[PDB]
Amino acid sequence: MVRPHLRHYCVVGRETPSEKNPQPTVYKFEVFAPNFVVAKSRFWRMMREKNKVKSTHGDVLSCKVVKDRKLAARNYSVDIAYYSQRCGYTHMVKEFRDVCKAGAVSQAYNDLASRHRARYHNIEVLGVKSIPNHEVRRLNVAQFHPHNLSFPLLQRRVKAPRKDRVIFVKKNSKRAVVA
Amino acid sequence: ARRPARCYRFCKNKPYPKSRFCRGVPDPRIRTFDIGKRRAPVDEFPVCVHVVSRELEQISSEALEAARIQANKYMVKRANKECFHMRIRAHPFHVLRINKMLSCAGADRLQTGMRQSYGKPNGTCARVRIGQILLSMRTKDTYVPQALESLRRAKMKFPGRQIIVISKYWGFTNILRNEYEELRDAGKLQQRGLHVKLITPKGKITPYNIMA
């Protein structure tokens, strides 16, 4: 992939300034959020629920962007919770192998949107992980896992008119599909 | 047709129950909320299924009775009398108002104006909320599919959205069924009537035990 849509930030935060909490105890996520404004919102938000704590009372120390390994595909497993359908939290497990976890989160979200129709708030993406065995579950990832996986493919595009030459006036020459 | 239940999909108004204020009270049919064995120690039905409402709805008695009897019918007919104890877990009572206009004091049209039009007793319904186990049925595990099938008539005797859930809870009773058995085994479980009682960690004065 990598249309790097979505961003990844790690947030590290703390409970009460108050000595009523003398000594707060500290929170981490690396979270895919498209900006930090959100990120911290989200961070806080489970804190406002799961942990019941209002942001306006407590304190995030940090929110810092978090980078992927390197240059190549690792097999990601994805775990999902979506709340919609006017019927709340529901789970799913899905599978992507790519080079970026981010691209995976990203791709999920469209995928859900297209694919389960969904919308983004309503998802809490639980997790993405590089899968080590030769599995790697899902049939489509396994499908294209093959050593010596290779292919044929045909029949599409390039923009026919254009400013990079050239709209309506075409063709100067003759036709088929071309390949 | 009938001042139909479809039409009463809203609520608008207050809760309208029976009240002193009520004196127009009509009376539906719908009677026997507990079916099967009503002295089924909890052990009798280990198993528990709820027939839940999905939400927010309003429901007529007519439907309610109809499923009841249906419930019993298929069930018993297939499966025996007690093999569950099918329990209507919902009592409902909310009182309906009628127009039913034109009480014949004049000619015809513009008969009323509105003239304290104001609702006559029409029926009972619950204007329901919060995914109520409607009927709860407690079984014995074996009798589960039979349990389900009645519900298939039963759902049909409502309209609207009602869902079918089995609970870890024992038959109208409490906890994941394995832990419940275990609960008896570990003794943390105590029998009352069909209904049953559970032990406190605050600990009071004194059931004592042995020995003399």
């Binding site: 499908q143 292919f151 044929p152 493919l153 045909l154 029949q155 599409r156 | -």
Partner: protein, 189 residues
Amino acid sequence: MKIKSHDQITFPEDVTVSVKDRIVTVKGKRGTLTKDLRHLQLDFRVNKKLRTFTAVRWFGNKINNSTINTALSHVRNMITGVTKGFRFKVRFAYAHFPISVTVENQLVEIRNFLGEKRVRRQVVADDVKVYRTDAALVKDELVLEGNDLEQVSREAAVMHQLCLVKKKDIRKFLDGIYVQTKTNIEVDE
């Protein structure tokens, strides 16, 4: 979009096939039989030039996967006609009312039904060939044969449909001229 892809063909042995275009041209014992297929093009790859041809797909959609088979089989059957041909047997069947069918050759004439009503006539399309055969206790019998089952069949099925009846109950209705054996002309090589 998700890759099926498109392409061409599977194979057996002693019969030549087109291998090109939408069109399979199958040639064997009984001549050559050929068909042009529409969207039916699909992951070919020749495995032997003369000896192995398959088309058994890489990826694509659900619907796609079915076709692949349906395609082979039919062309296989193109081979079948070209090799061992088709022979359909029909027998006229009737009890209350006797029923007669002849064959003009170029056309099939059907008489008698229910005392006869209309005369059912079917022109003999190409290579469905028609024989009324009767000795050897060949019996109220038509034989349709040639090297295209689909045609031999189509004409045949057509016949079953030519002997339809309406009004006044299937529980007394039966009689008509029914398919009695759809086969090859023979076993052949």
